[PDB]
C-alpha cells in the first residue's frame, strides 16, 4: 500500500482554535501530520519560533501522529525534503480560495509530485484568524474563546514584559 504524510504550513503567530480543529481533523485522515512553522526571517512575527513551536506542542502534542518543525525557504523544497504526500491548507474565504488555487498550480509546476488538499472550517471557527487575534490582544481585548489557554498566558507574559 504506502504511508501518508501531510504538511500543514503556517506562521501560527499564534496558533488558534481554528488551526487546532484543522490539525485534529487532518490527523483522522492521514497517517502523519507535520505542523510546519515558517520561521519568517523577512516577515517579523510577534512570537518567536520557540514560543510558536511551544504553544503548538502544548495544544496538539496529545495527538500521537503530529510532528512540529520550523522551516524557511521554498515550501516545495520542504515538501521534497519531508517526503510528503500533500500540503494541507484551510480555506476561510474567497480570497483564500483564489490565492491557494494559484499557489497550488505554481507549486505543481515547480514540482510535478506536489499536491494541495483543502479543508473548510466548521462554522464556530470561520471568523478566527491569527491576525485578528493579535489585533484584539494588542487592544487589551479578551481572546480566550478563540485560542488555547497557553496562548492566553503567552499574551499576558508579553503585556507583562510591557506590550
Ligand atoms: C502560506 C504561508 C505564507 C504561511 O501561511 P499563513 O501566514 O496563512 O499562516 P496562518 O497560520 O495564519 O494560517 C495557516 C493555514 O490554515 C488556515 N486557517 C487559519 N485560520 C483558520 C481557521 N480559523 N479555520 C480554518 N482554517 C484556518 C489559513 O488560511 C492557512 O492556510 C507559508 O506557507 C509560506 O509562505 N511558505 C513559504 C514561501 C513560499 O514558498 N512562497 C512562494 C512559493 S509557495
Ligand atoms: Cl499572519
Ligand atoms: Mg490564520
From Swiss-Prot:
Pathway: Cofactor biosynthesis; coenzyme A biosynthesis; CoA from (R)-pantothenate: step 4/5. Coiled coil: none annotated. The record marks 19 as: Transition state stabilizer. InterPro entries: Cyt_trans-like, PPAT, Rossmann-like_a/b/a_fold. ATP binds at residues 11-12, 19, 90-92, 100, 125-131. It catalyses: (R)-4'-phosphopantetheine + ATP + H(+) = 3'-dephospho-CoA + diphosphate. GO terms for biological process: coenzyme A biosynthetic process. CDD domains: PPAT (cd02163). Substrate binds at residues 11, 43, 75, 89. One of its GO terms (cellular component) is cytoplasm. Keywords: ATP-binding, Coenzyme A biosynthesis, Cytoplasm, Magnesium, Nucleotide-binding, Nucleotidyltransferase, Transferase. Its cofactor is Mg(2+). One of its GO terms (molecular function) is pantetheine-phosphate adenylyltransferase activity. Its EC number is 2.7.7.3. It is found in: Cytoplasm. Homohexamer. Belongs to the bacterial CoaD family. Reversibly transfers an adenylyl group from ATP to 4'-phosphopantetheine, yielding dephospho-CoA (dPCoA) and pyrophosphate. This is Phosphopantetheine adenylyltransferase. The lineage of its organism: Bacteria, Pseudomonadati, Pseudomonadota, Gammaproteobacteria, Moraxellales.
